Structure formats: structure tokens, C-alpha cells
């Protein structure tokens, strides 16, 4: 478990100064700290930190990675490759745990929702509708963290089973404020919190499709 | 990200600070407090601190400090610093400690 | 007449750890400070200090 923190400064002149409208500067500065803490938690979950020996979810050495042909190749949609690879990933999760775990959640890049909206030829209902009809009981969502997975434009898709006994995030201490410590003519307020990152108990229930 | 990376002093390097006592952050091994790898540390950059010594005689107040290659004070060490001796000189049970004053790099 | 003094430090994490595990640290540090004060008084009485005359 690790601890997080920052601080902010404010002066009596700025406190006394008034404005036409809007939230006060103290409130805005206090909200900025909470936003920064939440963003740091997300960044620890999705990116890791080498010096602190925190392993990200894309760099875990015990999960299954699948190389994929590109779904979009120079504005040329391939709506069958996506379905084939998704079915392959689901079957891999099914057959790697010997039937004790079934895939339930898919996360895809937000820019690839156009591939799954194509009408299948010589019919009405789309590829996504056919996939849902054949695999009723699964949830598909979009995450912007998947647009880039290694800093160079590499995309990916994540298929997993959401279950507390398989993986979870701990936040033992919530975000809080400490009393200001006055100086000559200004103040100072520190902020602290705690977190742990992401831990996986069964790394055989997660599949990452890279290169998409 | 802004996190500094620290490690034990070696030959021909430049000291930056001294690890200080903490009843929560430190881990107990070989009957001593240490900082295990991949964990936060408390480095000290200014003020008076007690440091382990390998010398046999008391130093001179206000003189310059010289360290060994393992991060311990020695009368004729090789690594030169700008820190000073703050005057203190004592001995716990079979451990030699000396009071050294630190200023910012 | 003369005057004495000392101090000690402690952190929030240490305070919480002590109150959770049962044994605190502030009580021990305060006891050490008080005993040091009393020992200094006794040493001053029975040995004195030349620079302070």
C-alpha cells in the first residue's frame, strides 16, 4: 500500500479580494487537488510505475496477449476480423480456466465503434447485434485509455470477467484536508490520501488483444 | 513525475542526503532499520543529524567532513563533502556516532 | 536561577499506527523527556558545571 499527497498556497489579499461571479479561488484550488489525486490513481492503475515496483495491467507478465490484424487498414473497415478475434478471445478465456470462468466484459477504443455499426450484407441487423444475439449475457463498453497503450499509438482491446475475487482496487484512506499552517502573510494547506494500485489474483481471466 | 531515485553511496559519487529514523517507514533486518527496495525514503538535506562513524578520535568543531565508500564518516576518507561537524561525539553500545550538520547541495 | 528544556518529534502515521496496534510512542517519548530533565537536575546538584559557574 502507498500514500499520496500534495499541497496548495493562498494569500490573505487574494482571499479578501472579491469577484463578479464564479466559485471562490479557495474552492477552485481545493478541487484541483482532489482532481489531481484521482488522476494519479487512474494513472497508477493504467500505467504503473517502474521505480516503485508497480506493474500495470497491460504489462502484467502472466496474462494472455493476442496479436491481431488491424481492424482498420487505411480507411478500409474489416467487420469480420473483429468478430472472429473477439470470439477467439472469449473461447480462450473459456478454455484456459477449464470452464470455471466465462468472459463478461469487453472494452474497446472509442474510435472503433464505427466498425461494429456496419450493416451485414444482404440483411438489416448489424454485426454487433448478431454478436449480442449469439453471446447474450456480455457487456461491451468504450474506454479512452485504450486509444494508446505504449505511448506510440498502439491500440488494444481488453476482454475480462468482472469479479471481486479475481481482482480489485483498495483505497484504505479517503482524500482529506489538513488545517492551514500560517506564515508571515499567507497560508498553506496539505492534502493526503492512500491507494494500492491494481492487483490480480487469477491472471488467467484477462485477455489483451494488441495491435488493433 | 518528479520522483528522485536514491541508492547507497559508491566510489566517486556525490552525496545528497542522509536517511533518518522513522518507526513506520523502515523495515527491521539484521537487528537494524533499513529501507527496502521499491519504497519511499526520508532523505535529510539540512540540519543536524547523528551519523555512523568509523573513526577513532574526536573531530574538530567546524571542520569539513570526509566520508568512506560505504556512506560512513571517516577521518581520512576519499569522498569530500561540504558538510560540517556540529560538535557532538558520543558512543552507543559498541556503535560510534557523530553529529554532522548538512546544508543544501 | 537557571532554565532547562528539550523536545521530541512524532508523525501522523506513527500516531495512527500506535493507536491501532495498542502501544503508542508519544507516551514513551514524554517519559524519556521527563526522566532526562530529572537526571539533569540531579547531575547539576551533585557535579556542577564549571563554564556556567
Amino acid at each position: 500500500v502507498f500514500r499520496l499527497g500534495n499541497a496548495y498556497l493562498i494569500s490573505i489579499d487574494e482571499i479578501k479580494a472579491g469577484q463578479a461571479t464564479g466559485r471562490p479561488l479557495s474552492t477552485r484550488k481545493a478541487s484541483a487537488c482532489q482532481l489531481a489525486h484521482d488522476q494519479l490513481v487512474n494513472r497508477l492503475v493504467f500505467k504503473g510505475s517502474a521505480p516503485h515496483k508497480i506493474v500495470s495491467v497491460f504489462n502484467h507478465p502472466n496474462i494472455t496477449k493476442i496479436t491481431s490484424g488491424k481492424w482498420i487498414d487505411a480507411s478500409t473497415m474489416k467487420p469480420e476480423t473483429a468478430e472472429a478475434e473477439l470470439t477467439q478471445a472469449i473461447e480462450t478465456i473459456e478454455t484456459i480456466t477449464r470452464g470455471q470462468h466465462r468472459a463478461t466484459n469487453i472494452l474497446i477504443p472509442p474510435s472503433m465503434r464505427k466498425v461494429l455499426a456496419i450493416r451485414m450484407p444482404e440483411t438489416t441487423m448489424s454485426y454487433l447485434d448478431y454478436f449480442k444475439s449469439q453471446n447474450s449475457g456480455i457487456e461491451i463498453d468504450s474506454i479512452a485509455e485504450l486509444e494508446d497503450i505504449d505511448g506510440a499509438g498502439t491500440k488494444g482491446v481488453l476482454v475480462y470477467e468482472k469479479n471481486p475475487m479475481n481482482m480489485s482496487i483498495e483505497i484504505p484512506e479517503a482524500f482529506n484536508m489538513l488545517p492551514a499552517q500560517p506564515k508571515d502573510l499567507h497560508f498553506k494547506v496539505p492534502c493526503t490520501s492512500k491507494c494500492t494500485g491494481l492487483t490480480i489474483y487469477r491472471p488467467m481471466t484477462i485477455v489483451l488483444i494488441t495491435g488493433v | 513525475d518528479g520522483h528522485k531515485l536514491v541508492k547507497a553511496l559508491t566510489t566517486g559519487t556525490t552525496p545528497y542526503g542522509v536517511a533518518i529514523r522513522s518507526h513506520w517507514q523502515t523495515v527491521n533486518a539484521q537487528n537494524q532499520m533499513i529501507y527496502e527496495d521499491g519504497g519511499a525514503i526520508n532523505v535529510m538535506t539540512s540540519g543536524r543529524v547523528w551519523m555512523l562513524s568509523k573513526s577513532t578520535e574526536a573531530p574538530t568543531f567546524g571542520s569539513a567532513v570526509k566520508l568512506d565508500v560505504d556512506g560512513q564518516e571517516k577521518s581520512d576518507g576519499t569522498i569530500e563533502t561540504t558538510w560540517t561537524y556540529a560538535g557532538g561525539w558520543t558512543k552507543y553500545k559498541d556503535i560510534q556516532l557523530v553529529e554532522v550538520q548538512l546544508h543544501q547541495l | 536561577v537557571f532554565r532547562l528544556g528539550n523536545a521530541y518529534l512524532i508523525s501522523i502515521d506513527e500516531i495512527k499506527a500506535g493507536q491501532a496496534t495498542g502501544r503508542p510512542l508519544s507516551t514513551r517519548k514524554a517519559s524519556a523527556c521527563q526522566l532526562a530533565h530529572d537526571q539533569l537536575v540531579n547531575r547539576l546538584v551533585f557535579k556542577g558545571s564549571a563554564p556556567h559557574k
Partner: peptide, 26 residues
């Protein structure tokens, strides 16, 4: 001997769940 006043076990947690390997029969 210059250790702290808290041992590791006092600041340690054991998760209340065990994982069992599975061997399907056939």
C-alpha cells in the same frame, strides 16, 4: 539491536479467502 517498536506481524493483513486448484474428473 536498533530495531523499531512494531514488528511486521502487527502491521500485516491476511485476506479471508483461499484459492483452490481444480481437477475436473471427466
Amino acid at each position: 539491536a536498533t530495531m523499531g517498536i512494531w514488528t511486521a506481524q502487527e502491521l500485516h493483513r491476511i485476506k479471508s479467502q483461499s484459492y483452490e486448484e481444480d481437477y475436473p474428473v471427466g
